[PDB]
Amino acid sequence: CAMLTTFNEVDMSNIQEMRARHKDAFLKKHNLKLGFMSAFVKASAFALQEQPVVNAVIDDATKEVVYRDYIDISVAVATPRGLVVPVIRNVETMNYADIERTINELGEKARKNELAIEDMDGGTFTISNGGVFGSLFGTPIINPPQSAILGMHGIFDRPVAVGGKVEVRPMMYVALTYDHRLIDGREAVTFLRKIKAAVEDPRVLLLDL
Amino acid sequence: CAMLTTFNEVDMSNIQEMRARHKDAFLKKHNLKLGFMSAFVKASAFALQEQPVVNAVIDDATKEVVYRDYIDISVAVATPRGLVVPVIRNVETMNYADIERTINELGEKARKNELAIEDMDGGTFTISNGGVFGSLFGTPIINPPQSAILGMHGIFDRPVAVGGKVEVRPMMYVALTYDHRLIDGREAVTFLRKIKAAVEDPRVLLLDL
Amino acid sequence: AQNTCAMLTTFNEVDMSNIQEMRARHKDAFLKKHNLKLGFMSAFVKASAFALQEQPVVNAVIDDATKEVVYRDYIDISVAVATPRGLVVPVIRNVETMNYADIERTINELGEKARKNELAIEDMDGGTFTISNGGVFGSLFGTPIINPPQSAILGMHGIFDRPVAVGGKVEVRPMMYVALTYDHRLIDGREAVTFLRKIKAAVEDPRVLLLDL
Amino acid sequence: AMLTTFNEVDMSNIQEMRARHKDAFLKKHNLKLGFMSAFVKASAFALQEQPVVNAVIDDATKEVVYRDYIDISVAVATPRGLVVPVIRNVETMNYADIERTINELGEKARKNELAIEDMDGGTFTISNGGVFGSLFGTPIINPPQSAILGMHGIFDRPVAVGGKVEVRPMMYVALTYDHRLIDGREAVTFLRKIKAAVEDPRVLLLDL
Amino acid sequence: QNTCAMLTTFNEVDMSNIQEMRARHKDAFLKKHNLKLGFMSAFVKASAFALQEQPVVNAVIDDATKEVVYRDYIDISVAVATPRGLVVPVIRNVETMNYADIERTINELGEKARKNELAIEDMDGGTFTISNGGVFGSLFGTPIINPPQSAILGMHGIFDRPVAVGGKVEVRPMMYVALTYDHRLIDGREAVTFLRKIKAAVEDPRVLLLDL
């Protein structure tokens, strides 16, 4: 076991304003609640596209890097009974209108206990959300056999310096645990920073920066 | 022939913001510059996706409405010898970066004039960027065999009303000339409204309203 | 359309301060008295009737078979309804008598009939003037399609808050563009411009209808 | 095994108490008031709320042993090194008794006359790393317990309370817990309960 | 994090003085000594004078089967880490106690170009006491490192961010950095780690306790 964790801060204001502006029409059309988790899942998929090493795995049996091209992100909808990780498959071709549908169905499966065995294995990324309980920032545990996991924590209003001026903005601490045997610090730090950039400004997803 | 025209106005404040913040990154990553045209092409593609009637064309030989799953926008490119209307195919599977790259390669082909006819046929929707030459608004001419075209114009700073206040915002007119036989009043204005919405904030495209 | 016939659509802006403020401070009594609704449809229809009375040429239709102008007298405003199955255009006859309330009653009746798909072919055609609505779907302005054999059509669009200079100072006022697609073969530029300006004057200040100006 | 999660506590009520009740303690109990007792009692309240954090995995026979007694193993600094005495049955003591036990353990520790029966049997550890001046960090779980709450320095830091920026005495609180017994949500709610109890001592009275 | 007793403790460092130092003296170094002022020359020095008092960090756990007796080394040698594209190596300064800030940067920079051209001899990487993880590349918040064995302790490089802070009970936005230090619990006490964390962050904002 070798878990290396890097933290970073994500400005939550842009996506909250987008939700407040577009929640009504989105709920009217797709019958879904607009949430901040779809933005994070899409950003994770995008950053995984840019940096495929985070998507790979090293087989301890043969000591060789095993690259994966398909992107599957497992979300944590952990039931009061215990921790459960439903898997979203092929997230690289979904928008914000999707993902929300998929997480809703997977949560429904978890509540009604149709979460079969195959729905929690074969994931390439994990987006465990411990912020629904108000955690400031903590270090999650790498889910085997995956090589990374992104931890989303609670949103709180803290003063942040913007252009030399103190402003109160809603900010999220985000964690990323990686195995240094495969991912070096440069790669994981860049990956987390790029996730932060994609969540902070959703237009880069359209610009492909 | 039987062409009707309807108008609206688009506020390019988010497009201006995203071209004020994401030019250095776009140039460093793609060796290419960012422009207004990609936003309008993507907005037209999204509107045609969510309203397949305008995407369809009535063939005069058999008087049949013909639907097409694919979308290919006939963007006009400026050349010293004469205006040309090439076609960029499958607009539904590309982001702003891909639109910019195909428009740049099309322009660099047109400058030295190696454009074959294979890149000029098969049009579904035409956009004429008349903003290079200062134009307030006016009725554009369609390029058949397609049904309706969207005519862009120049972007001028004009005073508008946002919450009762008067501020100067970069705002331009849009005209959608449509074949009145197939498209009636409601879709001819809803199409333009959706284009307006997707250009005012690109986050609608990502959120898929 | 464009080349098929003579459109020559003319445009004007109509402020909605008077009508909107009136309905804002007159709607409860109307709901307690007739019980339907209160809208600007009745105001625009009656203003069109007034302007059509003042300018009888726009009421007259041409007869291409004989090249004879037919000076129709009864005002037959044919309004449009944005039904789920596209759009339908019923008709209202003898508009001059109704003031605001009877036009509103006929509008409500015809809308309920169209929603129920009971609009008979009788009260569907034969109008002398048409009014379209591209206002429910907010459109800044557009070119209306002339409904034949009628000779003109009103194409009012949505109402937007825009900064408008009144007395040298910029103040935000509820504006809206209105279009008129006439027939240049019969109506000149002067007549169509005067028509649009008279409708603008009769909607900007409804007391003109009482004053007959 | 070891895994940690962090949070922050606004230490405004405790400093106000120490400001308004230091002389009353000095002249009624002959001991010095401190913010140790607030955290010990908050930890006791959280342990009583969640018995899972008070449990232990026995590697001898792979069993989950529950303990009814609550014992916080406070850390006492000595020149010879680091000695950790265990204060017993914390449920039945208020701030005064916690302070008395801490003073007694300090007096007995400085004299090198703390016996082996006073080291063992602990069920929860608290490591005050703030006497040296740390911002935050990771504590280690001393065997055979299951969690440790480490405190850090109390630093005046600007916080957005009510939408305005003000300088307030805040410290970072972290607990390191094993994942084989305590889940992530349990640890987060445990730390938040400690935060609530220290931030508002009247919660301990209201039992919520 | 388990590995071998790999806890971590965190702190912050004030870098208003150093950038104030560098905003006035950059031209002098370029003229007299032809090299540029960086950050590591302050952190590599702050660590070195933090080790000359408490040499338990210089101690390593060696002999047969590891834990037998301390091995105190009277020499200080800091292993700064520099990034290539060919995997980050850790270059190392020898007998660096007796040499000042400039000799720390001349040694660093010319030795940086010494590995930009792959002119490397393995004799220049012997197992010395201590590594200072040089992470001044990628603008992020708080890392955990992995004490580059056999080294016993480890330093971080975190990044300067404009952060609102309370200076003298007043809010004064300054651009700040965080730091951690990853200590092997075995024969390295928790309390002594905070003291060296503080002083490696005290000799940094007030550069003149190096003279005291």
Swiss-Prot record, chains A, B:
| Residues bearing PTM N6-acetyllysine | K23, K28, K29, K33, K63
Active site per database record: H180, D184
Top-rank taxon, per record: Eukaryota
Localization per Swiss-Prot or TrEMBL: Mitochondrion matrix; Nucleus
Subunit details: The 2-oxoglutarate dehydrogenase complex is composed of OGDH (2-oxoglutarate dehydrogenase; E1), DLST (dihydrolipoamide succinyltransferase; E2), DLD (dihydrolipoamide dehydrogenase; E3) and the assembly factor KGD4. It contains multiple copies of the three enzymatic components (E1, E2 and E3). In the nucleus, the 2-oxoglutarate dehydrogenase complex associates with KAT2A. Interacts with ABHD11; this interaction maintains the functional lipoylation of the 2-oxoglutarate dehydrogenase complex.
Function of the molecule:
Dihydrolipoamide succinyltransferase (E2) component of the 2-oxoglutarate dehydrogenase complex. The 2-oxoglutarate dehydrogenase complex catalyzes the overall conversion of 2-oxoglutarate to succinyl-CoA and CO(2). The 2-oxoglutarate dehydrogenase complex is mainly active in the mitochondrion. A fraction of the 2-oxoglutarate dehydrogenase complex also localizes in the nucleus and is required for lysine succinylation of histones: associates with KAT2A on chromatin and provides succinyl-CoA to histone succinyltransferase KAT2A.
Family according to the record: Belongs to the 2-oxoacid dehydrogenase family.
Q: What is this protein called?
A: Dihydrolipoyllysine-residue succinyltransferase component of 2-oxoglutarate dehydrogenase complex, mitochondrial
> Which gene codes for it?
Dlst
Span of the entire protein shown here: 246 to 454 of 454
UniProtKB/Swiss-Prot annotation, chain E:
Q: Where are the transmembrane segments?
A: none
Q: Which domain of life is it from?
A: Eukaryota
* Active-site annotation: H183, D187
List modified residues, type N6-acetyllysine.
Answer: K26, K31, K32, K36, K66
Where in or outside the cell it occurs: the entry states: Mitochondrion matrix; Nucleus
Its biological purpose is as follows: Dihydrolipoamide succinyltransferase (E2) component of the 2-oxoglutarate dehydrogenase complex. The 2-oxoglutarate dehydrogenase complex catalyzes the overall conversion of 2-oxoglutarate to succinyl-CoA and CO(2). The 2-oxoglutarate dehydrogenase complex is mainly active in the mitochondrion. A fraction of the 2-oxoglutarate dehydrogenase complex also localizes in the nucleus and is required for lysine succinylation of histones: associates with KAT2A on chromatin and provides succinyl-CoA to histone succinyltransferase KAT2A.
Q: How does it assemble?
A: The 2-oxoglutarate dehydrogenase complex is composed of OGDH (2-oxoglutarate dehydrogenase; E1), DLST (dihydrolipoamide succinyltransferase; E2), DLD (dihydrolipoamide dehydrogenase; E3) and the assembly factor KGD4. It contains multiple copies of the three enzymatic components (E1, E2 and E3). In the nucleus, the 2-oxoglutarate dehydrogenase complex associates with KAT2A. Interacts with ABHD11; this interaction maintains the functional lipoylation of the 2-oxoglutarate dehydrogenase complex.
What family classification does the UniProt entry report for this protein?
Belongs to the 2-oxoacid dehydrogenase family.
Its protein name is Dihydrolipoyllysine-residue succinyltransferase component of 2-oxoglutarate dehydrogenase complex, mitochondrial
State the organism named in the record: Rattus norvegicus (Rat)
Q: Gene for this protein?
A: Dlst
Portion held of the full protein: 243 to 454 of 454
